[PDB]
């Protein structure tokens, strides 16, 4: 009966102005609901930014951000927007827009959310990923199981999708989250465990896709 | 009985966020009046920035600036505010806050204004003025009379007041508008024409006052 | 302003157990508290509002309690689809602050990690960087300590590490610890080691290699 959808740039630069928009369907913007903006940094909890009344037009913000935040509304298009001026690198997060249901004299809860929108604040430019092989050997052999992988290093922005054998291999694979190096570039590793006998018979290739730069790379992983 | 008063920093730097406030007395913010912000660059006409409905809460802006402007309201303190993000050097102007009265279905006019608030956008820092005398010569003596003055130069930001002999001399003085040089600083000239015979009995001293730097200079 | 703390920051329990999370404020907020559930990478799901009023469509086993500065979310007969992160929220007056969050695990038999170490690749060395990757496959619990010793030199500040979520099948974790160096520093030493200490290891497990 209500469905929200974020929209806006997934990448802004430090000190610039961020502008996001949340479209609403199935209900009216001009109503007794409080349209709220939420954000969650990568790997952290939720942080209530601010909300706005559909009919009153008044706003409320997080006291730690009231100077840099601005909430708005557009009745005709069934939308409400959020602007964050003088952004900093520490604002990279997933920004949710939700409907804060309300009662006659008592607020209720955020019963309808949007899928969210990732937004990164970084000075680094879009740089395609460098893929290096992590070959199996006696060092990476515990028991009868051997482990290999691919090192996706120095790339920007997130995300990168990694498959093995062109999506044929899915059992035993562990693709790790990416860490933002001091260089402003991300880095991750995708490994796969296979029987030691498979090393001499079967072929293994990791398929990396980084569409932010239209990069598609495939890397064979061979012993020695 | 309406009365509006502007307040806020009289000086911001480029790219920073400008914020200004307008206190209202004699009327309620939550009313049918559309409270408005007007700016007027130095030596140019009026420019309508934006307004906001005291009750509807909806905002309207100038299409050439909608991306940088934010207007808000505060029902408790009887105030409304303006925010201009990513300010540029070309935004130096006097910012008025006015009450755009409203009828039942149409708008009237801005019948109540504030005195205004000057806000300069520049990277220069405060400086006290250098006072130099502009002495008369054979070219500044049209037979009778004799013109002199003081060149208040290299100071920032405006304004600067100039008095002669503690304000005793007043007839025939012309203080010209200050010019913003390529150096970012200001400079002006204040002259006064007097009888050539007055040089032997009266004394001429210009008293400059630049409060932004807490400076008081006197230079014969 | 308001400070909302949840406790325990994370706990592990098996299906069928009666679970309880606590959320405390720094000031009174009457019966206005909302609970949310968040799956990995997904948006939260409104569970409860008004302390204990259950949102429509939420199972009966979810129950809220408490008043003032001490609230409780209880799950009777925990189910598999309930393992997630749970947040509380003040919903009476601004700034409607969210709690710190509580993650719920699936308690499982202790499984020691499979330790693998990978030396730097020749392509990367040609590029001026050396990245020694150390892997720890499928291990429960999540608490595992990794150390880097280069020529028996304890390392610090030169390594990054990343962990996965609970595997949907074997409820085990996997950890990756990449040690990055300059090709100069890397070639200036001989033995590189990756020492692990975990609950399932009677003694630390080292996985080393010689540069030559």
């Amino acid at each position: 009966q209500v469905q929200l959808q974020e929209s806006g740039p997934g990448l802004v630069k430090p000190s610039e102005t961020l502008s996001l928009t949340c479209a609403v369907s199935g209900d009216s913007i001009s109503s007794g609901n409080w349209w709220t903006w939420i954000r969650q940094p990568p790997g952290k909890g939720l942080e209530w930014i601010g909300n706005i009344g559909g009919n009153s037009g008044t706003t409320f913000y997080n006291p730690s951000l009231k100077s840099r935040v601005t909430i708005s509304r557009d009745t005709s298009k069934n939308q409400f927007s959020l602007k964050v001026n003088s952004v900093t690198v520490a604002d990279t997060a997933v920004y949710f827009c939700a409907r804060h249901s309300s009662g006659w004299f008592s607020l209720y809860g955020l019963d309808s959310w949007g899928q969210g929108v990732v937004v990164t604040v970084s000075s680094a430019s879009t740089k395609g990923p460098s893929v290096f092989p992590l070959a199996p050997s006696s060092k990476s052999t515990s028991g009868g199981t051997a482990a290999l992988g691919c090192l996706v290093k120095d790339y920007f922005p997130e995300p990168v999708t990694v498959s093995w054998n062109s999506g044929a291999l899915t059992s035993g694979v562990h693709t790790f989250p990416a860490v933002l190096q001091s260089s402003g570039l991300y880095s991750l590793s995708s490994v796969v465990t296979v029987p030691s006998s498979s090393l001499g018979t079967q072929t293994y290739i990791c398929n990396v896709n980084h569409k932010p730069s239209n990069t598609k790379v495939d890397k064979r992983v061979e012993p020695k | 009985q309406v009365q509006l008063q502007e307040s806020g920093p009289g000086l911001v730097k480029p790219s920073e966020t400008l914020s200004l406030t307008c206190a209202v007395s004699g009327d309620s913010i939550s009313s049918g009046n559309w409270w408005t912000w007007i700016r007027q660059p130095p030596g140019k006409g009026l420019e309508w920035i934006g307004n906001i409905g005291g009750n509807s809460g909806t905002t309207f802006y100038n299409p050439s600036l909608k991306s940088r402007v934010t207007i808000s309201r505060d029902t408790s303190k009887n105030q409304f505010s303006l925010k201009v993000n990513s300010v540029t050097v070309a935004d130096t102007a006097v910012y008025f806050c006015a009450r755009h009265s409203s009828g039942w279905f149409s708008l009237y006019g801005l019948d109540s204004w504030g005195q205004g608030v000057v806000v300069t956008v520049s990277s220069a820092s405060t400086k006290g003025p250098s006072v130099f005398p502009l002495a008369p010569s054979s070219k500044s003596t049209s037979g009778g009379t004799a013109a002199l003055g003081c060149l208040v130069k290299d100071y920032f930001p405006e304004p600067v007041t100039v008095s002669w002999n503690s304000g005793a001399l007043t007839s025939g003085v012309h203080t010209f508008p200050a010019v913003l040089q390529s150096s970012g600083l200001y400079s002006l000239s204040s002259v006064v024409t007097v009888p050539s015979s007055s040089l032997g009995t009266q004394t001429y001293i210009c008293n400059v006052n630049h409060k932004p730097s807490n400076t008081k200079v006197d230079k014969r | 302003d308001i400070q909302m703390t949840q406790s325990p920051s994370s706990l592990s329990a098996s299906v069928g157990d009666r679970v309880t999370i606590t959320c405390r404020a720094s000031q009174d907020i009457t019966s206005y508290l909302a609970w949310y559930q968040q799956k990995p990478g997904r948006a939260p799901k409104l569970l409860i509002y008004k302390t204990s009023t259950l949102q429509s469509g939420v199972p009966s086993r979810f129950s809220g309690s408490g008043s003032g500065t001490d609230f409780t979310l209880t799950i009777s007969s925990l189910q598999p689809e309930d393992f997630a992160t749970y947040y509380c929220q003040r919903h009476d007056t601004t700034p409607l602050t969210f709690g710190g969050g509580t993650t719920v695990e699936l308690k499982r038999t202790v499984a020691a990690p499979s330790v693998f170490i990978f030396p730097p690749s020749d392509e990367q060395l040609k590029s001026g960087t050396a990245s020694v990757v150390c892997l720890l496959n499928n291990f429960y619990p999540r608490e595992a300590k990794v150390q880097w010793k280069v020529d028996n030199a304890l390392q610090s500040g030169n390594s990054q590490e990343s962990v996965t979520e609970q595997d949907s099948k074997d409820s085990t974790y996997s950890l990756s610890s990449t040690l990055t160096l300059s090709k100069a520093d890397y070639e200036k030493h001989k033995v590189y080691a990756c020492e692990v200490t975990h609950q399932g290891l009677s003694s630390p497990v080292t996985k080393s290699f010689n540069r030559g």
Binding site: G32, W34, N55, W104, F105 | - | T93, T94
Partner: peptide, 16 residues
Amino acid sequence: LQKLNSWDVFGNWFDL
């Protein structure tokens, strides 16, 4: 810096 009160939750419920 006023706080949301029940009147704000009612005045915005049916208005305009």
